[PDB]
Design a protein around this ligand. Structure first.
Ligand code: GDP
Ligand code: ADP
Ligand code: MG
Lengths: 390, 360
């Protein structure tokens, strides 16, 4: 019931391995807090958030021409293959140069479309050097249909360097369709997927390569097959400080992706709230400065964009779409109540349901309870729209 | 056997092969229907006379099997003999003019001398059982009732029916690549060894074929791989029209004159191409391979293109297979590996030993 204990204790409510700051940094903050130099504590937190925000993610995607590299990249960026900023087939093979594609909302997340080694004249090791293998956080081999010698030569070379890579078998929807059409009397969708997966595992084993993470998926049906488990695996392999930016960049493909995003953002709000310093007044009896109000509007706009319920995403789905969810209406003025009155009402709802999250007589500033409330509101909005999509 | 493995694989994938077989009949559906309606205009059985000594038979249509550039091949039944056959029916070009078909007949049935029972019991070359004509109509000349746009010659070739031709097998694998287990992939090893032994058989008899292509290479119901189109067989070193070699299967050296010398190196080249397709589905050097995804469009080796042998887009293949393909595909025809000699190389001995060990 002392404050440093309450601070650190919040993170222990979260799934292990699923925190946004390391134990080391957390211990550092707990310590500065017990000191009592509020500037020092504020700085340690601000620094951790700076490190989180400024982290750049570089994701390499290699594979044969037509294997689904650009489609994969577009899928992760939540961009249509025909939309603006979409990666397109043919270009990398023509140029034989890698091409970066930034996530449209989180420009610190970058996907690199690499030319197939077959489109170049480099032997495996020379290819990996020319493509700057060591600069990527993830090196993903994209493979459609069946193994090619190129796929294995690249993987073997990485194996030799005692390094690692991910293997993604795309177009499994086409495999399942062809099994169902060509062999209906023996067709079993689950059995087909397992058969292909085991061919992947065993193919690596037979080439003396340590079994890599293997994902069977379809760029045309992202909420199914192994796309969500690929996302889980990728986040879990990252150094802790890189996880936030990648997590928030993820397409809102399932409830589970959406919810995990919420959990991450709750920890961020907790850090932001402690960086701003706790007060000795209940938020249900406070109000907001104009600066606070502007911070809140921007936080709402960010949450909405992250969860794909921003106005632009709604338009790509308008008054009829807005009407389905709650967040678009929050800052719409009425003679019925002021924005200060609406926001105090939200605090009442939030704090009545959840309490003040702290030992007695200590509170976060009102704006942070409001961020929590908006975060909950946006994630529900996200799930509501996803169901319409689905 | 060897053969037994391949027999079991075809049986396992019988439904899939059947699906792909039917799918390939869809585009030429008009041709297939017109030819069917010419040969079986009213009754399910057509009475035919042998152009040799086999006398009279009644052929019942079971189903269309395959379409070629100049023909339709049907599965038929001689109920009285309790025997099924492939029956090849020729459309009239002129690609199959009356004189060309008379010449095809003589070359086809002379080929055994170049003994029918013995060549039949040895099971390397797929020989026709008979050549027949619909009763009461002159042989070779157009068959009535004629159907618009698809004139059919009254000359029908009766053969053992293969389970599948390698072209259809490759098209089937390109649709759904059913090889997944380590055991499954022995199919590619077995076909590699079988193709080499088939070509070696030709070499041992001092004969050249020059049409050693997947649509003329047949897996029989017992799993044996056989080579068809026996009418093209020639003694090694003889001269003939170069145009008789399919252009995408012709070595560069065969594209320079209208007349060519037929050498064992010709078949060794085509052997290399067929082994490459076993592991790759498409032809090497960017050569156009109709019906196969990933194919490029190079019309022949005389058109400028990629002349280095590339394996990167193939199924992963053993180094000893790569070596053999590379030697069969030597552009220097005088240094090109021949199949009898290939069977003595460390690479072939390794291929044979690992197949025998895997099957033991
Ligand atoms: N059915 C299906 N088609 C796909 C999938 N991924 C890609 N494609 C299609 O396959 C073709 C090649 O994909 P693309 O991303 O352009 O290949 P790239 O050359 O590696 O960039 C395009 O027509 C895509 O629409 C998939 O998972 N399933
Ligand atoms: N005995 C047979 N059994 C099964 N299929 C056959 C047989 N003979 C030919 N075929 C198939 O029929 C098709 C046409 O035969 P082909 O000899 O290539 O004629 P074309 O000269 O018209 O191309 C080919 O796909 C071939 O594999
Ligand atoms: Mg043919």
């Amino acid at each position: 019931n002392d404050l440093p204990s309450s601070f650190t204790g919040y993170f222990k409510k979260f799934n292990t391995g699923r925190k946004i700051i390391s134990q080391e940094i957390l211990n550092l903050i707990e310590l500065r807090m017990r000191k009592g130099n509020i500037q020092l504590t504020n700085s340690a937190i601000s620094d951790a958030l700076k490190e989180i925000d400024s982290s750049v993610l570089n994701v390499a995607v290699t594979g044969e021409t037509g294997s689904g590299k650009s489609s994969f990249i577009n899928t992760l960026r939540g961009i249509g293959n025909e939309e603006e900023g979409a990666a397109k087939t043919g270009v990398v093979e023509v140029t034989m140069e890698r091409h970066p594609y930034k996530h449209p909302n989180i420009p610190n997340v970058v996907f690199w479309d690499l030319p197939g080694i077959g489109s170049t004249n480099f032997p495996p090791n020379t290819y990996l050097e020319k493509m700057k293998f060591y600069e990527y956080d993830f090196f993903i081999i994209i493979s459609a249909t069946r193994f090619k010698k190129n796929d294995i030569d690249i993987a073997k070379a990485i194996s030799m360097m005692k390094k690692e890579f991910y293997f993604v078998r795309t177009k499994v929807d086409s495999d399942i369709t062809n099994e169902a059409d060509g062999k209906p009397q023996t067709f079993d969708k689950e059995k087909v997927l397992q058969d292909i997966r085991l061919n992947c595992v065993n193919t690596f084993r037979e080439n003396g390569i340590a079994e890599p993470p293997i994902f069977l998926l379809s760029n045309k049906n992202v909420c199914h097959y192994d796309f969500p488990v690929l996302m889980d695996k990728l986040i879990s392999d990252l150094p802790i400080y890189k996880r936030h930016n990648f997590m928030v960049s993820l397409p809102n493909i399932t409830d589970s992706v959406i919810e995990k995003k919420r959990q991450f953002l709750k920890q961020r709000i907790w850090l932001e709230g402690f960086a701003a310093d706790l007060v000795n007044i209940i938020p249900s009896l406070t109000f907001l400065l104009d600066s606070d109000l502007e911070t809140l509007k921007k936080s709402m706009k960010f949450y909405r964009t992250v969860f794909g319920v921003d106005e632009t995403s709604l338009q790509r789905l308008v008054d009829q779409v807005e009407a389905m969810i709650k967040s678009p209406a929050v800052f719409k003025p009425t003679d019925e109540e002021t924005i200060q009155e609406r926001l105090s009402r939200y605090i009442q709802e939030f704090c009545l349901a959840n309490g003040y999250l702290l030992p007695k007589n200590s509170f976060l500033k009102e704006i942070f309870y409001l961020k929590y409330y908006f975060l909950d509101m946006v994630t529900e909005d996200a799930k509501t729209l996803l169901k319409e999509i689905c | 056997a060897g053969d037994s493995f391949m027999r079991d694989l075809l049986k396992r994938e019988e439904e899939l092969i059947g699906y792909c077989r039917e799918e390939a009949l869809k585009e030429p559906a008009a041709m297939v229907e017109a030819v069917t309606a010419t040969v079986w205009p009213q009754n399910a059985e057509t009475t035919v006379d042998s152009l040799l000594s086999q006398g009279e038979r009644k052929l019942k249509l079971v189903e269309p099997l395959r379409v070629g550039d100049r023909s339709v091949v049907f599965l038929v039944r001689d109920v009285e003999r309790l025997e099924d056959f492939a029956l090849k029916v020729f459309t009239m070009g002129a690609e199959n003019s009356r004189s060309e078909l008379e010449r095809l007949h003589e070359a086809t049935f002379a080929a055994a001398r170049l003994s029918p029972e013995e060549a039949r019991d040895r099971r390397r070359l797929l020989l026709p059982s008979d050549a027949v004509a619909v009763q009461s109509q002159p042989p070779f000349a157009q068959l009535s009732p004629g159907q618009s746009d698809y004139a059919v010659a009254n000359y029908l070739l009766l053969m053992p029916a293969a389970s599948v031709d390698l072209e259809l097998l490759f098209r089937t694998l390109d649709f759904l690549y059913v090889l997944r287990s380590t055991e499954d992939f022995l199919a590619l090893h077995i076909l590699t060894a079988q193709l080499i032994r088939l070509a070696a058989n030709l070499q041992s008899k001092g004969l050249v074929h020059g049409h050693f292509t997947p649509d003329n290479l047949f897996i029989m119901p017992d799993g044996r791989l056989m080579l068809g189109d026996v009418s093209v067989l020639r003694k090694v070193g003889t001269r003939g029209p170069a145009s008789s070699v399919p252009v995408t299967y012709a070595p560069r050296e065969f594209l320079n004159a209208s007349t060519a010398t037929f050498t064992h190196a010709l078949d060794a080249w085509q052997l290399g191409l067929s082994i490459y397709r076993v592991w790759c589905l498409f032809l090497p050097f960017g050569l156009v391979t109709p019906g196969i995804k990933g194919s490029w469009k190079r019309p022949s080796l005389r058109v400028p293109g990629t002349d280095s042998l590339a394996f990167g887009s193939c199924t992963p293949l053993p180094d000893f297979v790569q070596t053999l393909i590379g030697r069969f595909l030597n552009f220097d025809r005088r240094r090109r590996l021949l199949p009898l000699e290939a069977m003595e190389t460390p690479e072939f001995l390794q291929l044979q030993n690992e197949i025998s060990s895997s099957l033991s």
